[PDB]
Design an enzyme around this catalytic site. Structure first.
Site, short mmCIF file in Angstrom:
data_model
loop_
_atom_site.label_atom_id
_atom_site.label_comp_id
_atom_site.label_asym_id
_atom_site.label_seq_id
_atom_site.Cartn_x
_atom_site.Cartn_y
_atom_site.Cartn_z
N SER B 77 0.86 -1.17 0.00
CA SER B 77 0.00 0.00 0.00
C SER B 77 0.90 1.23 0.00
CB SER B 77 -0.94 -0.01 1.18
OG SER B 77 -0.27 -0.27 2.41
N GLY B 115 -8.12 -7.28 5.48
CA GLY B 115 -7.25 -7.39 4.32
C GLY B 115 -5.83 -6.98 4.68
N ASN B 139 -7.72 -13.42 3.15
CA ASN B 139 -8.31 -14.52 2.40
C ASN B 139 -7.22 -15.46 1.89
OD1 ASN B 139 -7.34 -12.79 0.44
ND2 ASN B 139 -9.22 -12.77 -0.79
N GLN B 143 -0.57 -15.80 3.36
CA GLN B 143 -0.39 -14.57 4.13
C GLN B 143 -0.56 -14.84 5.62
OE1 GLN B 143 -2.98 -11.61 2.31
NE2 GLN B 143 -1.35 -10.95 0.92
N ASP B 165 -12.84 -14.96 3.58
CA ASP B 165 -13.36 -13.94 2.69
C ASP B 165 -14.23 -13.02 3.54
OD1 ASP B 165 -14.88 -12.43 0.81
OD2 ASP B 165 -15.18 -14.13 -0.55
N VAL B 166 -13.86 -11.74 3.62
CA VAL B 166 -14.51 -10.82 4.54
C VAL B 166 -16.00 -10.69 4.21
CG1 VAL B 166 -13.96 -8.64 3.33
CG2 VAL B 166 -14.32 -8.62 5.81
N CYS B 311 4.30 -0.78 -11.63
CA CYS B 311 5.04 0.25 -10.93
C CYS B 311 5.26 1.48 -11.82
CB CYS B 311 6.37 -0.27 -10.41
SG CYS B 311 6.17 -1.46 -9.06
C1 LIG Z 1 -3.97 -3.99 -1.76
S1 LIG Z 1 -3.81 -5.14 -0.41
C2 LIG Z 1 -3.44 -4.08 1.01
C3 LIG Z 1 -2.85 -5.03 2.04
C4 LIG Z 1 -2.48 -4.40 3.39
N1 LIG Z 1 -3.66 -3.73 4.01
C5 LIG Z 1 -1.34 -3.40 3.21
O1 LIG Z 1 -1.56 -2.21 3.50
O2 LIG Z 1 -0.24 -3.85 2.79
C6 LIG Z 1 -5.54 -5.54 -0.04
C7 LIG Z 1 -5.65 -6.93 0.56
O3 LIG Z 1 -7.04 -7.30 0.69
C8 LIG Z 1 -7.13 -8.69 0.50
N2 LIG Z 1 -8.50 -9.03 0.14
C9 LIG Z 1 -9.14 -8.75 -1.04
N3 LIG Z 1 -10.37 -9.18 -1.09
C10 LIG Z 1 -10.57 -9.78 0.15
C11 LIG Z 1 -11.68 -10.43 0.72
N4 LIG Z 1 -12.85 -10.58 0.09
N5 LIG Z 1 -11.55 -10.93 1.97
C12 LIG Z 1 -10.37 -10.77 2.60
N6 LIG Z 1 -9.26 -10.18 2.16
C13 LIG Z 1 -9.42 -9.70 0.92
C14 LIG Z 1 -6.11 -9.01 -0.59
O4 LIG Z 1 -5.72 -10.37 -0.56
C15 LIG Z 1 -4.97 -8.05 -0.25
O5 LIG Z 1 -3.96 -8.68 0.53
C1 LIG Z 2 0.70 -6.69 -7.19
O1 LIG Z 2 0.16 -6.48 -5.88
C2 LIG Z 2 -0.09 -5.20 -5.48
C3 LIG Z 2 0.90 -4.47 -4.83
C4 LIG Z 2 0.65 -3.17 -4.42
C5 LIG Z 2 -0.58 -2.58 -4.66
C6 LIG Z 2 -0.78 -1.15 -4.18
C7 LIG Z 2 -2.20 -0.54 -4.23
C8 LIG Z 2 -2.57 -0.11 -5.63
C9 LIG Z 2 -1.74 0.81 -6.27
C10 LIG Z 2 -2.04 1.24 -7.55
O2 LIG Z 2 -1.23 2.13 -8.18
C11 LIG Z 2 -3.19 0.76 -8.19
O3 LIG Z 2 -3.50 1.18 -9.45
C12 LIG Z 2 -4.43 2.27 -9.50
C13 LIG Z 2 -4.01 -0.15 -7.55
C14 LIG Z 2 -3.70 -0.58 -6.27
C15 LIG Z 2 -4.62 -1.57 -5.60
C16 LIG Z 2 -4.62 -1.26 -4.10
N1 LIG Z 2 -3.23 -1.40 -3.59
C17 LIG Z 2 -3.21 -1.16 -2.15
C18 LIG Z 2 -1.57 -3.31 -5.31
C19 LIG Z 2 -1.33 -4.61 -5.72
O4 LIG Z 2 -2.32 -5.31 -6.35
#
Ligand SMILES: C[S@@+](CC[C@H](N)C(=O)[O-])C[C@H]1O[C@@H](n2cnc3c(N)ncnc32)[C@H](O)[C@@H]1O
Ligand SMILES: COc1ccc(C[C@H]2c3cc(O)c(OC)cc3CCN2C)cc1O
Ligand SMILES: C[S@@+](CC[C@H](N)C(=O)[O-])C[C@H]1O[C@@H](n2cnc3c(N)ncnc32)[C@H](O)[C@@H]1O
Ligand SMILES: COc1ccc(C[C@H]2c3cc(O)c(OC)cc3CCN2C)cc1O
Lengths: 336, 336
Positions: B77, B115, B139, B143, B165-166, B311
């Protein structure tokens, strides 16, 4: 040049319309500089500070004068102008219609109009929807009397008026529809206001609010600096708040939003322009009407200058950037 | 030139970084043209339509690869960079701190992180606040296993992980603090999501949400036209929504807003830049790690191209107009 000097020349009618408009526009320009922040981060910080601050918080013009200055139903809020040739009377009706659509008024409902003024909307709903019962609420005995007289003349049997300060009014009665048209600007305590309104709603009720706004930021209607003679002249009492178009989204403790609109500021600009032009046309008549209850021609000229300057200033405010700064916000809510 | 052609050259590494960045920037430029309306009236109409539409609605990378690409706690994130010289490890910690401040974390609270990813925030809170009990929800079995291992290595006794799954998780348990960090973007049904969260709160609870946003408008992460090869490459599944910075204000059926912030997009841009640079540095190592579980060097190159392009594209998106287009929104809520 001080406040006193400009105010002096203004009262004597020594400031032409061109100069007056230019001076007021500059005052509003400074408000824009005050309100707009360089980043959205800063903008939200500014806006949230304002919203947090909120959560911590007898002479009446004769009806004959009002009739000479305003449109047919003496609407004292922004109207809606379809065309450049739309008359103020037509624009009043169009606004009334717009409110009825957006507030989802249906025949048979109980309707409360809070701060109903001279009752244009109350009378409109009562006439269009014969099975509705319509209640206006006003703090003005003069306004109550005017509405009841008009209802009698229009053969309406479905109108009543509550005389009350809304902030003090206590009742167990509930309504299917509550309308608040450009009244919330005057509310000292908004969170409490919305809470009170919710106690007058059931699960089936809707609440419709219309308020003057700025699209981006909120502000009190008051002077920024010493150079602003305008704000304190128009509202000598710090009782008017201009919420941002989204400000009420943060007041959903007791109600929940269903829809949200804005109306471009040119409609308001056209409204105040129409009032100014009508007052100008009936100037001689207006002076004669006001003279008895005011005592002197000097006092009459003062009241007229105040109202006329309000219109000139309102024009500059709402027309700024083709109506894309100050405008009108509308929201529809249900009860929690 | 079609999608296939550009995608072909991209996979072969025939598109230089300068050209790739330029192409992706142009795609985002077209989104801005799509999203910005000429009047606030039209802007709100557009935004409300989006919000109304919402209300109607197995391969995993090895941990060794993630460690080679991301920062120390494998935060996936946006991070927070005080200085130009701030390292990704430092920026992860700064973000964690920021969340703890804004979510008003205090020692002794029960905390749920929805998540939780690789659990950087869960581990941070558990270590800083020994009397807190911290639960991560994910999920992903991989992890969960990673977090529990890290907790053991760090001698933490106050960490648990729910594998669920939330959207399907049912429990009577409530928490003092619920955190949702860049997870809501993946939620198919937000109104239901917020409702579920509210059932896991008491009157004393707070909910903190962080999500990627655009300041002005909302959009799904998907192609506008045929010229956009990028959106479908990155997310071949229409499962990512970019809410406007204010979108969640319209989802207060079950929770009430207390505070609202945004963080300028340059922080996110610096984050993805750091990941890209780190992946580039450990490229040879990354290819070796991925080879076993992928089968072929061709499959490895594909996965790497996808992550690297993500990226490069993220950089263009979040750095657009010095971080003043796409950014991160944060909100704090209490229960109704
Ligand atoms: C973009 S990541 C952010 C992860 C973490 N909060 C961070 O800041 O690094 C969002 C996470 O939500 C999880 N996720 C997505 N859909 C989900 C669901 N329905 N139930 C539980 N986790 C879920 C994904 O597997 C992912 O690890
Ligand atoms: C490959 O795995 C990932 C690693 C890091 C992120 C960062 C971030 C993010 C950053 C972006 O720039 C983007 O595009 C608009 C979408 C998202 C989805 C929400 N997420 C928290 C997302 C991933 O899916
Ligand atoms: C700007 S006028 C709008 C009037 C009317 N809604 C219209 O559209 O013409 C707002 C009205 O609210 C009334 N008002 C202000 N404070 C009030 C209060 N505390 N209780 C009741 N009415 C109040 C004023 O007297 C005024 O008539
Ligand atoms: C003199 O009596 C009035 C007549 C008409 C209005 C129109 C309108 C309005 C218009 C403005 O331009 C303004 O300045 C920002 C303030 C206000 C207060 C809210 N109100 C609905 C207000 C009055 O007080």
């Amino acid at each position: 040049e001080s406040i006193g000097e400009i105010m002096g020349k203004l009262m004597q009618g020594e400031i032409g319309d061109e100069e007056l408009s230019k001076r007021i526009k500059e005052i509003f320009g400074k408000r824009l500089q005050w309100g707009y922040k360089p980043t959205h981060q800063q903008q939200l910080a500014f806006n949230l500070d304002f919203i947090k601050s909120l959560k911590e918080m007898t002479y009446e013009l004769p009806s004959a004068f009002l009739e000479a200055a305003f449109g047919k139903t003496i609407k004292q809020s922004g109207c809606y102008f379809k065309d450049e040739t739309t008359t103020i009377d037509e624009a009043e009706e169009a606004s009334h219609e717009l409110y009825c659509e957006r507030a989802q008024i249906k025949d048979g409902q109980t309707v409360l109009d809070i701060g109903c003024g001279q009752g244009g909307l109350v009378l409109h709903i009562a006439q269009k929807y014969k099975n509705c019962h319509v209640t206006g609420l006003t703090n003005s005995k003069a306004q109550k009397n005017y509405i009841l007289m008009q209802a009698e003349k229009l053969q309406l049997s479905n109108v009543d008026v509550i005389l009350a300060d809304v902030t003090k009014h206590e009742s167990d009665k509930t309504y299917d529809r509550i309308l608040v048209i450009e009244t919330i600007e005057h509310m000292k305590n908004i969170q409490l206001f919305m809470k009170k309104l919710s106690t007058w709603m059931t699960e089936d009720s809707l609440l419709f609010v219309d308020h003057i706004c700025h699209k981006t930021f909120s502000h009190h209607f008051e002077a920024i600096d010493e150079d602003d003679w305008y704000s304190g002249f128009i509202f000598p009492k710090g009782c008017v708040t201009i919420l941002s178009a989204s400000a009420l989204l943060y007041f959903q403790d007791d109600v929940t939003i269903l829809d949200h609109w804005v109306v471009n500021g040119m409609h308001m600009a056209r409204s105040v322009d129409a009032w100014r032009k009508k007052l100008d046309k009936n100037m001689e008549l207006a002076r004669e009407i006001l003279l008895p209850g005011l005592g002197s021609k000097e006092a009459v000229n003062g009241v007229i200058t105040h109202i006329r300057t309000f219109c000139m200033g309102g024009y500059e405010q709402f027309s700024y950037n083709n109506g894309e700064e100050w405008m009108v916000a509308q929201m529809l809510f249900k009860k929690k």
